Amino acid sequence: SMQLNQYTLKDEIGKGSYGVVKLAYNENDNTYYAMKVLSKKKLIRQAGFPRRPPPGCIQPRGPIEQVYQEIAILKKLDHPNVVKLVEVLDDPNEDHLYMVFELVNQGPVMEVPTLKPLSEDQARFYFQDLIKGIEYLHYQKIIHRDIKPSNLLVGEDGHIKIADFGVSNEFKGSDALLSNTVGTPAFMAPESLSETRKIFSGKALDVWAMGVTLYCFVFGQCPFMDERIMCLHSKIKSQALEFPDQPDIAEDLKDLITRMLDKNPESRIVVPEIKLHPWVTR
Ligand SMILES: O=C(O)c1ccc(-c2coc3ncc(-c4ccccc4)cc23)cc1C1CCCC1
């Protein structure tokens, strides 16, 4: 192990989009926490080398601003279905940055693909948690942009907390107006995967990813899948949603998933409607 101020840093417990997460023991309050460890120089390099001056896809001028945005976002959020940032350790003369979170004991709910999906009733309990967390994020003008089962941590109490705010965005106004976005390929909405003159809604991207997540919950694999990236993108954009013959799930759950995975973001179900869907309220 190693010492960092009042913390004893132990084994690596997870690895998200950036950095690594260690188990950390706080000697002052005799409590364990989850500590995300980052290198500022590495975060800068992850964005790519800056371009020489020339004579929708422009590199950010100051890539380090994204981690400070993630920190500001996490500081704003206090909800039982969202991770809780408790401290940031950041010396301006050091390259490392540390983010301390309350521990969510059991880790990710699922790592897709799995041969062991959840039952329909357990999927409903976790999905009810997911709705509450996302509705709160959206109310706080935050889009997560990386909703998937491996970013949903199960606590001591059997409830989920949304984690990995590495690519999250805070917007002004009613919704985020995006020209392009980031995400895990199999969870990205069809509108985000074309060359077009049309911007798209950030909140509806989170809904699409919730739809893929819910499908994963009960089936253990994504609805659109291919190892070839061009084929995966083509399927997300043009392949009709299908459900496997087994496990046989309820018709109302198929209705809900179908509405969340509507390829048209204008007609895709919204979170206020998802909350009142018959499968959710049963
Ligand atoms: O990469 C980040 O941005 C990030 C930041 C904080 C936590 C975290 C906070 O509280 C936690 N309690 C528990 C765990 C955990 C425990 C066991 C196994 C895996 C994760 C992770 C966290 C987790 C992450 C990601 C790394 C894999 C999951 C998502």
Question: How were these coordinates obtained?
Answer: X-ray
Closest C-alpha to 79, from 168, 204, 15, 163: 163
Token code pair at residue 43: 């975060």
166 marked as binding residue: no
Q: Is any ligand 1 atom within 6 A of the Cβ of residue 16?
A: yes
271 marked as binding residue: no
Residue 148 belongs to what domain range?
Answer: 1-282
| Domains identified in the chain, total number | 1
The structure tokens 């179908």 sit at 258
As a whole number of angstroms, the longest Cα–Cα distance in the chain is: 62
Structure resolution in Å?
1.7
133 marked as binding residue: no
Q: Is any ligand 1 atom within 6 A of the Cβ of residue 107?
A: yes
In whole angstroms, how far apart are CA 51 and each of 13, 48, 54, 109, 182? 36, 9, 8, 40, 21
Q: Which of 12, 15, 21, 71 is the best mutation target for the ligand 1 pocket, counting ligand atoms within 8 Å of the beta carbon and taking the most?
A: 21
Tell me the C-alpha distance between 136 and 132, whole Å.
6
**From atom 24 of ligand 1, which residue's Cα is the shortest distance away?**
164
**From atom 2 of ligand 1, which residue's Cα is the shortest distance away?**
164
**From atom 26 of ligand 1, which residue's Cα is the shortest distance away?**
16
8 Å CB contact between 88 and 36: no
- Our answer to whether residue 146 is catalytic in this structure is yes
In whole angstroms, how far apart are CA 245 and each of 202, 219, 248, 249, 250? 33, 11, 6, 9, 12
What phi and psi, each to the nearest 5 degrees, are found at residue 50?
-65, 145
36 marked as binding residue: yes
Name 222's Cβ contacts closer than 8 Å, sequence gap at least 6: 112, 113, 186, 187, 212, 215, 216
Token code pair at residue 163: 């984690």
Name 137's Cβ contacts closer than 8 Å, sequence gap at least 6: 77, 82, 143, 144, 162, 168, 206
Q: Is any ligand 1 atom within 6 A of the Cβ of residue 101?
A: yes
Active-site annotation holder among 146, 164, 206, 262: 146
Q: Nearest 5°: CA angle at 196, between 192 and 200?
A: 45
